């Protein structure tokens, strides 16, 4: 997987940063960022984040690729995209989603997409499933270290409710799980109060909502 | 078919890419895309896509290939275009025939059958 953050290409001069400067211009011999990547890894997945913020000129780069599969490097070499898949993400949203991306992705662009894949809001059941996944990954690490961990249902409900934000989705979950569960445990395990052969069960303290356990 | 995309030349800085950097410039010994393509393939079709996106001063190179048949690179070598078919494409005059006049009495609005 190749990844680019399109928010880094908001300004006009950054367009040549992706392809490479013309000869005689500073930095031309450094090459581009996009065309070498697609030469080195011709069968990769290409992901462009937040393509709803890039400078309009990069869209001409994209239209060329989507239209015929290739870009020419500033050294005259061809970047062959016929074996890569292009995934672009956006916060544009269908009519409004369209107008916000469409503004640059005018019909001349939208006709070049094979599809639009829509990603749904998380339900309460999903935020609980996401937490179960995070807890399990910790349980695996602990088993490898000789420690058994069980998190109570009141502990799971709290973490799912706390690490989920309608405005950030599941992203904040990484720190909510790490800071409430992984960190306190790491301290004990390293200190040696909890050792290989140990067991901890994590309950909530109803008046604090802390994750409380020991051995 | 020698094909160039004019959307890659939107700033007065992409011309050296076509003909080469001056002596003493970091890209000097590279050559130049347009003259090398023409020298290697003297009998060819040359296509310049969306020639309405090139920075306007890029036209001043073509204005030297359409009249005399040649272009000189940064080593003084000449490309010879006498056996090249040159095609440029554009939609520049289109959005001038998609509208009606505003008023009670209509006009014609076809003479700008895109001279614009």
């Amino acid at each position: 997987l190749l990844r680019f953050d399109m928010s880094e290409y908001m300004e006009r001069h950054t367009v040549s940063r992706l392809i490479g400067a013309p000869p005689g211009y500073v930095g031309f011999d450094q090459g581009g960022l996009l065309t070498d990547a697609v030469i080195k890894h011709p069968h990769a997945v290409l992901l462009l984040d937040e393509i709803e913020k890039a400078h309009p000129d990069v869209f001409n780069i994209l239209l060329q690729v989507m239209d015929n599969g290739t870009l020419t490097d500033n050294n005259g070499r061809k970047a062959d995209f016929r074996n890569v898949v292009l995934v672009m993400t956006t916060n544009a949203g269908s009519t409004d989603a369209m107008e916000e991306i469409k503004k640059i992705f005018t019909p001349e662009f939208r006709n070049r997409l094979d599809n639009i894949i829509w990603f749904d809001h998380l339900s309460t059941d999903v935020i609980h499933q996401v937490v179960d996944k995070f807890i399990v990954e910790l349980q695996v690490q602990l088993d490898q270290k000789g420690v058994s961990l069980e998190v109570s249902q009141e502990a799971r409900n709290w973490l799912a409710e706390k690490g989920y934000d309608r405005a950030m989705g599941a992203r904040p979950m990484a720190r909510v799980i790490q800071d409430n569960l992984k960190k306190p445990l790491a301290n004990e395990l390293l200190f040696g109060s909890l050792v290989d052969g140990g067991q901890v069960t994590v309950a909530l303290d109803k008046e604090k909502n802390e994750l409380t356990y020991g051995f | 078919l020698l094909r160039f995309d004019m959307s890659e030349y939107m700033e007065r800085h992409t011309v050296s890419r076509l003909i080469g950097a001056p002596p003493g410039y970091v890209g000097f010994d590279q050559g130049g895309l347009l003259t090398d393509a023409v020298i290697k393939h003297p009998h060819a079709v040359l296509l310049l896509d969306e020639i309405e996106k090139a920075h306007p001063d890029v036209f001043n190179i073509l204005l030297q290939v359409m009249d005399n048949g040649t272009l000189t690179d940064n080593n003084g070598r000449k490309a010879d275009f006498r056996n090249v078919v040159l095609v440029m494409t554009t939609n520049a005059g289109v959005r001038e025939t998609e509208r009606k006049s505003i008023g009670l009495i209509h006009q014609d609005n076809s003479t700008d059958a895109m001279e614009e």
Partner: protein
């Protein structure tokens, strides 16, 4: 800040208009205050502007006005009838006198009115000072106008002409439900 600014996202990401140009874009025209000459002149320009942009779509005209000059108001009336797309007229606040006349002139089936609005109609007013010979000339002209206005009311409302003449002798006030029964509007809007 008599008129606020609004910002929209377009092909280059930004346009900055007022609180009225933004709505013109959404094919909404407002008619308020006295129907004079300068204001009428501007409404006609806006309607012609919208017809050209899209001859197939409706134009919404919001009416809230006490009345005005007939001559000025006959422009607009003729433009609404001349142009291709339907003009749908919506009454808010009041539509009195010439305001009521334009309200009923909207496309048939599209004459709406909000539930607490009022519509009022009456014969035209005027006057003159001069020699008895000039007084006669001017008296005849106002009477012809009265007659013409009555025919247009009957045409648009479906009332007989004689019924229209009796009803405009003195100020007649109609509540929104009365305007519907009478035939000045087709219906009452309730909620979006």
């Amino acid at each position: 800040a008599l008129v606020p600014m609004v910002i929209e996202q377009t092909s280059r990401g930004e346009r900055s208009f007022d609180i009225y140009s933004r709505l013109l874009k959404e094919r909404v025209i407002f008619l308020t205050g006295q129907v004079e000459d300068h204001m009428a002149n501007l409404i006609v320009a806006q309607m012609l502007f919208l017809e050209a942009e899209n001859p197939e779509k409706d134009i919404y005209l919001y009416i809230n006005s006490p009345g005005g000059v007939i001559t000025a108001g006959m422009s607009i009336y003729d433009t609404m009838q001349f142009i291709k797309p339907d003009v749908s007229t919506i009454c808010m606040g009041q539509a009195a006198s010439m305001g009521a006349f334009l309200l009923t002139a909207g496309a048939k089936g599209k004459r709406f009115c909000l539930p607490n609005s009022r519509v009022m109609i009456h014969q035209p007013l005027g006057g003159y000072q001069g020699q008895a010979t000039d007084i006669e000339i001017h008296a005849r002209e106002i009477l012809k106008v009265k007659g013409r206005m009555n025919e247009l009311m009957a045409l648009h409302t479906g009332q007989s002409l004689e019924q229209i003449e009796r009803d405009t002798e003195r100020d007649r006030f109609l509540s929104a439900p009365e305007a519907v029964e009478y035939g000045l509007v087709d219906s009452i809007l309730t909620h979006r």
